[PDB]
Amino acid sequence: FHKIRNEDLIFNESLGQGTFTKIFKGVRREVGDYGQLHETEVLLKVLDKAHRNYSESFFEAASMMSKLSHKHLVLNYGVCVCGDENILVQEFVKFGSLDTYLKKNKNCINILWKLEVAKQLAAAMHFLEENTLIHGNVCAKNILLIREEDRKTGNPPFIKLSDPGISITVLPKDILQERIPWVPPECIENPKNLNLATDKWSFGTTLWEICSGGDKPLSALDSQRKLQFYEDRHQLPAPKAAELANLINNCMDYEPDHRPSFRAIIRDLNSL
Ligand SMILES: Nc1cnc(-c2cc(N)nc3[nH]ccc23)cn1
């Protein structure tokens, strides 16, 4: 990772919190192409000082995202590890993450919008699958909206997949259980089972989010009941707009080896 000095970063408003992290809007002062000076809007993702012992996994997450370059993967600009800070500096995405956007625009997101976003996410995951690169935390909170749909010019929405954060292979068990049903059953059994099939399950859960208007699946269940949901081999209810429900359930297969390739997922989406 490129090293960015603290002096070149300005922290502005808080945008929220993640697992052992806090996120801010900020500005990066930099020399850009042709030697021009720029003040660039950035997302600043800060590891909590109390959780400094996760710094390797925290940065390994971003390192994953920058191993490869792709139009549907968030851009990491660098890191700031001056002083006692562990900061990831990322591109600033004006419209934020899809969990919020789906709730706020629930009245005007239709089947075609959801299909286009699902296709784009499946394209990103196919690229990761072809490169045998595990993401490990696919969810609507980690999908960023670069561009809104503009029917007046035909333009579809455009999304990117953000970094997974600290890996489920190192997080406390209680956090993994709270993350059912994004974390697949085999990873609740043994977080070391994380592998490419993990991301097919979580893609199903994310498609359920995209079809459910801001709702979080199983949010009414406490952690014990989420565990028992897996023990009883239940599936998520179909979204009211159920066009993708069979794909959701085929991806959320309790047998990891039976989950379909992202090539097959893409062919299924193109059939609709
Ligand atoms: N790479 C990223 C990631 N998230 C945002 C973002 C934008 C916004 N308008 N509100 C937000 N609220 C929380 C996060 C966020 C921006 N850029």
Side-chain angles (χ1 to χ4, degrees), residues 1-28 30-35 37-48 50-51 53-55 57-66 68-93 95-102 105-140 142-150 153-172 174-191 193-223 225-239 241-266 268-272:
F1 266 131
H2 177 65
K3 298 293 185 301
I4 298 167
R5 56 199 188 109
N6 211 335
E7 312 92 87
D8 289 333
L9 296 174
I10 300 306
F11 279 81
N12 297 316
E13 62 262 44
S14 165
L15 295 177
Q17 59 182 54
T19 300
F20 304 151
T21 63
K22 289 176 171 37
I23 53 159
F24 299 84
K25 193 171 180 178
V27 173
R28 177 188 180 195
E30 60 182 318
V31 180
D33 295 334
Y34 312 106
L37 290 161
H38 291 96
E39 294 208 1
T40 305
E41 292 188 329
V42 294
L43 195 284
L44 297 166
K45 186 170 297 191
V46 189
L47 179 68
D48 291 343
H51 296 295
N53 65 314
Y54 288 98
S55 56
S57 191
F58 168 85
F59 288 122
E60 189 46 59
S63 283
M64 173 253 155
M65 292 300 293
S66 297
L68 312 177
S69 181
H70 191 271
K71 65 182 182 184
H72 289 302
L73 296 179
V74 68
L75 174 57
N76 295 320
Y77 293 138
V79 301
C80 176
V81 291
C82 300
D84 61 355
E85 312 281 15
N86 290 116
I87 303 157
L88 176 68
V89 187
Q90 302 183 304
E91 66 175 306
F92 186 73
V93 169
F95 299 103
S97 48
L98 230 55
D99 55 328
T100 306
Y101 191 88
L102 296 154
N105 301 272
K106 167 166 50 163
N107 182 61
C108 71
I109 284 178
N110 64 9
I111 175 62
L112 303 175
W113 188 106
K114 296 174 195 169
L115 182 60
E116 179 65 34
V117 166
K119 281 169 181 183
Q120 287 181 33
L121 174 63
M125 302 308 300
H126 178 65
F127 174 83
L128 292 178
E129 184 169 29
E130 292 274 276
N131 281 279
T132 63
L133 192 56
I134 296 160
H135 185 273
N137 188 21
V138 181
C139 59
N142 287 334
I143 300 170
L144 305 171
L145 186 64
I146 306 301
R147 186 180 74 203
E148 303 192 281
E149 175 175 62
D150 177 359
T153 65
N155 247 4
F158 190 94
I159 58 91
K160 292 190 186 193
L161 172 70
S162 188
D163 69 284
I166 293 163
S167 179
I168 63 174
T169 65
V170 299
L171 288 170
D174 57 297
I175 293 182
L176 260 59
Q177 294 181 5
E178 302 174 2
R179 292 188 180 183
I180 295 172
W182 291 271
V183 174
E186 67 277 8
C187 288
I188 297 298
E189 176 178 335
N190 187 342
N193 280 329
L194 172 67
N195 77 337
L196 290 170
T198 298
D199 287 336
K200 293 165 171 79
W201 175 284
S202 307
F203 172 90
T205 309
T206 301
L207 291 189
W208 190 100
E209 291 183 275
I210 287 165
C211 296
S212 299
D215 295 355
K216 297 302 179 281
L218 310 183
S219 66
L221 298 187
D222 66 3
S223 272
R225 286 170 172 164
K226 290 182 151 93
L227 282 167
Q228 191 62 36
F229 174 97
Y230 279 175
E231 288 285 330
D232 294 317
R233 303 290 211 87
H234 285 308
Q235 306 292 157
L236 292 180
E243 294 76 19
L244 295 189
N246 291 322
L247 182 54
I248 290 164
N249 293 342
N250 287 341
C251 289
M252 296 179 79
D253 197 311
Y254 280 84
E255 174 46 62
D257 286 357
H258 295 178
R259 298 178 190 146
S261 72
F262 276 103
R263 180 170 272 109
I265 290 170
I266 291 171
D268 225 3
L269 291 167
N270 290 342
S271 84
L272 303 170

